[PDB]
Design a protein around this ligand. Structure first.
Ligand SMILES: C[C@@H]1O[C@@H](O[C@@H]2[C@@H](O[C@H]3O[C@H](CO)[C@H](O)[C@H](O)[C@H]3O)[C@@H](O)[C@@H](CO)O[C@@H]2O)[C@@H](O)[C@H](O)[C@@H]1O
Lengths: 307, 315
């Protein structure tokens, strides 16, 4: 049986699977009331990608497509309707068993980035843009979204268009940032489909452990973060290896290689997420040289050493 | 001896190691007159990172630091000086044996992206949260003010005032501002990391075919443009996932050349073969420039260690 492994990458060598950001800290929040059911950075321990998860770091919260129409918003700014394809350029087939094109953002908010176009030497243009994923016009599962620009006219219809995500536009009350609220991929009255399952601890005293990244803001006050269940390099590693899962729960140790000492241990669950025995919220303070090492297969009743 | 391996990733599952872009096509250009000596995407087959290469896809052509002040520059736009640290936030130590902070761009051009800031100081009335701002920015890596090895660079903005002094600053690369003649885009011309008239140091070595009939094989990505005409590309020697894989594995190199086959897994058939050289680059037996037109399911598979005199089957 092909032995299970994790990459040997320290926190400072890992990136977020839910937004193109480095991992900044490990993080817990035991009193979280939301159902945690993110769709990017989802991969089983035996290498099955789930939700909208794909392998490219460049594909996370990316879109590819063509602009079809300009619409002016009542207040301020210009909106552009965009028909989206798969990230590899092939037509998105809504009948495929995915929630949305792979790479589609998996949270409610105003995602800030750059729209760029290269016409079919060709002419080019790029502008700052915002995609409101909570918008009724955000319907990637139906093959179309809307983005807004400060630019009022210089966006071309019928030309190949790329969205490069950069951060959030805002996290103020009216910007509906909630990292655990899924978009309605087909619009507000339609049920999301083919989702990666929710994740949660099942053992008393345990809480989820997240890989946290701080995300840039176009403006306003805030220090927003995006928490992923596993970094993108773990998704890539699990996918490559496809090691059989020998129980539902792997025991992993967070080790300081310079001392060889275990800093803490965690459960790595079959569906691809971590729990720890910790009764507090906040970052995990751990040496920079640290990384997770697979120890053994255990079960749901294994008692983790308290952090 | 730990066996050498490559990841099993098709072209559509690979990203560029010199700019945050997917790999679009494999590419050759036998008649290239430039010395090929890029500094990102440099890793030996036994896992030694070289040049300015680091592991994070988010770190490639990124900067982290602090704006010091707005500055006057001859060229169009509003200009800003920014100190740069290592990407992990620690001070960059110029005495380290690297050309520049890891992640620094390794080509001449106007690199377009977004500068964002999150203030250090927080406001009680805003729930003890910091103020933020982001704007488009351009870094001209050929500028005499581009001195990342000295811990300082300059960027320009269309925005005329809303960039804060003394605040933590991130550059997220997006593409190029221009490839007009006056924007000096040349993917094989290195920046002067310490400024005009200084010799770059600690470089990853140049790469070249040594065997007649062979040429370099590149992983090519098309890079976005803020404006103007063009279809610019960035060619890397190995994709970022190969850098990450080689670094993990650190398998001993058993000769100077690994024979690899580009395989179509749907047929199991070899489409062509290539030499994967110890220093971390590919050559093929091809006598033309341009894309390699190959089925989308394709990937390289390690076959055996050979020697420099191995004759490749013509592509
Ligand atoms: C907290 C504040 O956030 C950002 O300002 C925005 C405002 O942005 C507008 O004004 C600023 C200058 O004040 C700048 O010109 C920016 O380009 C422009 O769009 C505006 O969005 C208001 C709307 O209520 O919110 C914030 O004040 C940022 O630019 C500021 O530097 C500052 O960090």
């Amino acid at each position: 049986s092909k032995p299970f492994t994790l990459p040997i990458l320290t926190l400072g060598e890992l990136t977020n699977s839910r937004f193109p950001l480095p991992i900044d800290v490990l993080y817990t929040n035991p009193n979280e009331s939301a159902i945690v059911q993110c769709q990017n950075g989802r991969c089983t321990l035996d290498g099955e990608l789930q939700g909208t998860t794909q392998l490219l770091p460049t594909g996370i919260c990316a879109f590819r497509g063509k602009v079809t129409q300009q619409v002016q918003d009542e207040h301020r700014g210009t909106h552009w309707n965009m028909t989206v394809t798969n990230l590899n350029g092939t037509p998105f087939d809504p009948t495929e068993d995915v929630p949305a094109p792979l790479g589609t953002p998996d949270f409610s908010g105003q995602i800030y980035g750059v729209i760029s176009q290269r016409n079919t030497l060709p002419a080019n243009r790029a502008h700052e843009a915002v995609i409101a994923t909570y918008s009724p016009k955000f319907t990637p599962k139906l093959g179309n979204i809307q983005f807004s620009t400060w630019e009022t006219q210089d966006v071309s219809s019928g030309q190949p268009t790329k969205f490069t995500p950069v951060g959030l536009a805002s996290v103020d009350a009216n910007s509906h940032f909630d990292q655990w609220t899924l978009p309605s991929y087909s619009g507000a009255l339609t049920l999301n489909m083919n989702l990666a399952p929710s994740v949660a601890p099942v053992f008393p005293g345990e809480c989820l452990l997240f890989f946290r990244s701080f995300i840039p803001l176009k403006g306003g006050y805030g220090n927003p973060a995006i928490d992923c269940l596993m970094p993108q390099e773990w998704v890539q590693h699990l996918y490559q290896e496809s090691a059989p899962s020998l129980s539902d729960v792997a025991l992993v140790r967070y080790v300081n290689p310079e001392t060889g000492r275990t800093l803490f241990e965690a459960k790595l669950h079959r569906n691809g997420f971590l729990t720890v025995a910790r009764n507090s919220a906040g970052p995990v303070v751990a040496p920079t040289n640290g990384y997770f090492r697979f120890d053994s297969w255990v079960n749901q009743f294994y008692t983790l050493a308290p952090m």
